[PDB]
Structure 1
C-alpha cells in the first residue's frame, strides 16, 4: 500500500518525460525546462559558464538556451514577419502591379 502526502515543503518525487528530438533552422515552437517560446534554433559560438543555463540580452529578452541532454548553446532569433506592399502604375494607365 502506498501513501502520497503534501505539506508546506518542497516536492521531490515525480517523473516527467519529453525526450523529443530537436530540429534546427525551422520556425519551431520550443519548450525547454520551464521556459517556452517560438523561434528558429541555430548553433552558436557563445560561451556559457558551467553553471549558467540560458543567456539573455538588454531589455531582458531570451537570446540563447542550453539543452539538458547534450549541453549545447543554441541561439534564438524571432520567426520572420513583415508588411506586404503593392506598387501600381495607376489604374487608368495599366492593370499589372508589383509586390514588395
Structure 2
C-alpha cells in the first residue's frame, strides 16, 4: 500500500489514478465504492483492511510565464496554478 503519492490504483476494478490519504469518513460495512455529487469515485475501502482511502486527483494546473517586456529584460517567473510546490 502506497499513500500520499500519486499512483495508478486498481482495487477490484476501480482502474483509476490519484493520491490516496487516510479518510475520516465512515463507510457502511456493505459499502465499498465512494462517490461525490458529480458521481466520480471519491473514496475506496481497502480490500485487505478496514481503512478508508480518499482519492484526490493528481495535482494539475496551468503554467503561466510572468515576464516583463523583452525590451526591458529577459528574466521570467513561472506560476504553477493551484499546485503545492512540494511536488513541482
Measured against the shorter chain, the TM-score band is 0.7 to 0.9
For 2:48 and 2:72, how far apart are their aligned partners in 1?
Answer: 63
TM-score norm. by structure 2 comes to 0.84
Tell whether 2:5 aligns with 1:49: no
The structure whose Rg is larger is 1
Large movers: runs of 4+ above 4 Å: none
Query: 1:71 Cα shift?
Result: 2.2
The Cα of 1:50 is off from its aligned counterpart by 1.1
Question: 1:74 & 1:65 partners in 2: Cα distance?
Answer: 5
Cα shift at 1:37 = 0.3
RMSD: 0.9
Cα distance per residue 1:8-67 (max 9 Å; x no partner): xxxxxxxxxxxxxx1000010000012210001100110111111111111110000011
TM-superposed CA distance for 1:68, in Å, is 1.4
What SS class does the counterpart of residue 85 from structure 1 fall into? strand
The within-5 A match list for 1:1-100 is 22-100=1-79
For structure 2, the 5+ residue unaligned runs are: 80-88
The size of the alignment, in residue pairs, is: 79
